[PDB]
Design a protein around this nucleic acid. Sequence first.
RNA 1: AUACGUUCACUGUGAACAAUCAGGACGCUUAGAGUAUGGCCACAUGAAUGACUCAGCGCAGUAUGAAGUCUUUGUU
Lengths: 163, 82, 87, 150, 128
Amino acid sequence: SETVTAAFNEIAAGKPELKDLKIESVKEVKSEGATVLVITVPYKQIKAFQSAQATFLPDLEKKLNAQICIIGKHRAPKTPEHGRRFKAIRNYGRTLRSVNDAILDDLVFPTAIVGKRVHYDVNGKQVTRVILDKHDATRVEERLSGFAAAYNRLTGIVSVFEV
Amino acid sequence: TTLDVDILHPSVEQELHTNKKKTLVPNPRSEFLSLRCPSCTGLTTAFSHSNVPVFCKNCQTPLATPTGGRILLADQVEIRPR
Amino acid sequence: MQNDAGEIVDMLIPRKCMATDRLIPPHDHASVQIQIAKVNDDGLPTGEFETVVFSGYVRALGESDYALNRIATEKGLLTGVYRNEAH
Amino acid sequence: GRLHSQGKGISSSTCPYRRSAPHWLQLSAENCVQMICDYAKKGVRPSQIGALLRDRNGVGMVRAVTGVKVLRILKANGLAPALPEELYHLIKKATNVRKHLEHAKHDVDGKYRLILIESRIHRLTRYYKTRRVLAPNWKYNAQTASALVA
Amino acid sequence: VRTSVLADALKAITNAERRGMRQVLIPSSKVIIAFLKVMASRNYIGDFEVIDDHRSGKIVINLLGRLNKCVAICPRFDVGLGDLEMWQAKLLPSRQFGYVVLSTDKGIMDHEEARKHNAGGKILGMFF
RNA sequence: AUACGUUCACUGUGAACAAUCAGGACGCUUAGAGUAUGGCCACAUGAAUGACUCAGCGCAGUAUGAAGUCUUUGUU
């Protein structure tokens, strides 16, 4: 894109903390109400972004007319597929399950999660059902659809988000 | 009512009444209390159950003292929720 | 049960309990078949009944009381009664 | 308490559901690594170290600060105990109860409970010799008990 | 000690169905979730919720009330297609209903699936 | 840097390995058996297949169940 990359470098002027931060990539989504932007960060840089963060995110969200959900590059295969490098034994962090669950605790950062579950249907198909802490939002109440779109892009999963 | 009990979404009563571990999400009943002796104005964190008797920086006497369960609040002392 | 060229076979079909959903055999004489009069708003009978069934298992335990609360409120013959409150 | 015993216990801590947090408090990843190493210099066992941080510095889970368990932090800096902590306490118990059975030898309840500690140790020492913490050649005797605890 | 889960959990579901409950509470796993899924395709069961606790897990079943026994036999005997139609005759009551959940190479599926795919494997139990 | 990046167990498939048992063909007058026998112009055949069977051998599939994984710091 370089909508967010141009937007970040101008607001990064004058700040010691945001001085060395970088963005790899971004994926826009269809959110019914507005759109949402999902901004990937090089892993070691997550807690550098995420230490303060809430200074600049209102300024970035207001300018682009969209919500911003910051995410780590969490990547993870047991069987070689080619075009990828795979550890034989592998590691828990490396595996997909850790990746998909680490992704949530980025996406909805500031509230954190009380409950999580699945609902398996009579047909067979499955619906994840995350529950946000009932204390942080307040704010979380406003952006629920945005996450359901955004999380369905990254992991492929039909979720909902509730109190 | 042996046959019908709704167990996905129980009452607020029934979560408190059941055991620490037995709940649908298991998580504890114990939190870090803020404390203050009316002598000082320094606001001291503590773990409610403890093991160790709690002091502030300044005085000398323990702020809270250990039993089996919750801390036994010696003297007039108070709790600010934060 | 079906003959599969076509048709239906067997004589009689045991009625099924509304609470438990098991079969009501020939000889369980503790089985029950209610009639409850559905009524027009303002309490006028419409000459049209709902027939609630229980097996002899469910009555034997005690619980056939509590099913009548659940089943009637589902069909729309009560308000309150089912669901809360003690205290 | 089910192992060498009649009784079915169920009583322990339950970790909070969310490992991360809390933002409300205030602690640091680098500062907590110093404080763990602070106490370990003065000769404390990792079972007690986490408890001191809980009751002084309002640290709930120490993992939930650092991303790291307490024993890994000591072995990273390179300054843990040589014996495991559970093993240390049993041989320190068993040397003390054997000191008692010298003095008055009639309490067969002392003898019965000398076994069931001496038995517990031989189970653990097998487990630790598989993980390669203790070398095959390491042993526990009466004569070597006081050399290991000291 | 918990020797087996899939063995244990299907006992608890059966004790609900005899009694005639509406829902049951099972530590969860990835074979138990698949065993419940395969009998959900044949409509013996309702529809269930595999909940998180950063732990083993739990399941909450929703019972439809149409089910007589879940066995889970062990030890897990190997079975191969030509050998299989003995294990129908022993394990099931009838010929004309009730299925034999076995973990084929492709996945865990009824006998009726497994003979279609032409893949046997180790057997888990049954239901009827 | 168009094939190589764990092996097994287990499953499918393929190789390998007489009579009897099961089973196909054929009216020995029938049957138990036997390998025949049927077409008037010199012809047509059949003597199958499966099981016997655990181990050992190959390719393919990875759901279940194993091993693989020297760390007060390991691999090139």
